[model samples]
Target: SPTPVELHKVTLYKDSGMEDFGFSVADGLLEKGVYVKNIRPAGPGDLGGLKPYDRLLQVNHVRTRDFDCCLVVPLIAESGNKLDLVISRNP
Candidate 1:
């Protein structure tokens, strides 16, 4: 497959209910069930110790396997700094 877009930081911003809103960087491996694909070179996700091919169980103490990128995007994008990620890995 063509190299997945060189997963990297994105300054994503959106309007919230009461604020102009802002964007943080996406720097972790975008994951799936057993398929961790997207990866960023720098940003919050990387600084937080997220790795590739692991199962992301919880994010910021909330469940994620049931959420999509849109939901996760906002949560992580707004963090503005490193956040906690619970990944399940078996090696």
Candidate 2:
């Protein structure tokens, strides 16, 4: 039986050309998957509905299931002003 989860699509916009997305992703220490590690309050991520511990499903429609943080970072950074993320959360 697969674990039940809910999916969320979040869109974040960069306020400045050099500003960060205000969130970070990391591989689970024991779970073996990419998850949202941190989100700065009131920042782009937070304001855009990103939540800590949310599992990353896709970035800009690119699957992230097997991608490490290094790859995910650059993908988001290069997406310009807007970022589209698909994440999963346990209910």
Candidate 3:
């Protein structure tokens, strides 16, 4: 599948009811699928072991390879303080 060997499953829990998930994603520019674009240091995403450029494979067990940024954003937002993400990264 030409994919990298470093795959990760991350679970993030928000620190506050109104706090963000602490990460962001981008897609359809120079990559094939949704990728982690940014992460707030020491935030939920960082504490959960997420990194920039990590390709998003799944969001809450729903495959994201065919999803756009718009689609991926809502999935995370609607997760209600908890998120499950599957990602891959290059070595």
Best by TM-score: 3
Off by over 4 Å in 2: 1-4, 17-19, 29-31
> Model 1: per-residue lDDT, tens digit, 1-91?
1333222222322334422122222234445432234444553335444445434456566776566555666555454444455554444
| TM-score of each predicted structure versus truth | 0.45, 0.81, 0.82
Alpha-carbon runs more than 4 Å astray in model 1: 1-36, 42-47
Total clashing pairs in model 2: 0
> lDDT of model 3 at residue 4?
56
With candidate 2 superimposed using the best TM-score fit, by how many Å does residue 27's alpha carbon deviate from the native? Answer: 1.7
Q: All models: lDDT? A: 0.43, 0.77, 0.78
Residue 37 lDDT in candidate 1? 49
lDDT of 3 by residue, 1-91 (tens): 3455478888888655643588888885765668778999888889888877777788888998688888877777777779888887765
Error of 3 at 40 (Å): 0.2
Angstrom error of the Cα, residue 91, model 2: value is 3.6
| RMSD (Å) of each candidate, 1 decimal | 9.3, 2.8, 2.8
Candidate numbers sorted by lDDT from highest down? 3, 2, 1
Better of 1 and 3 by lDDT: 3
lDDT of 2 by residue, 1-91 (tens): 1445568898988755654677888876565567778889888888888877677788888997677777777776766898898888675
User: What lDDT does model 1 reach?
Assistant: 0.43
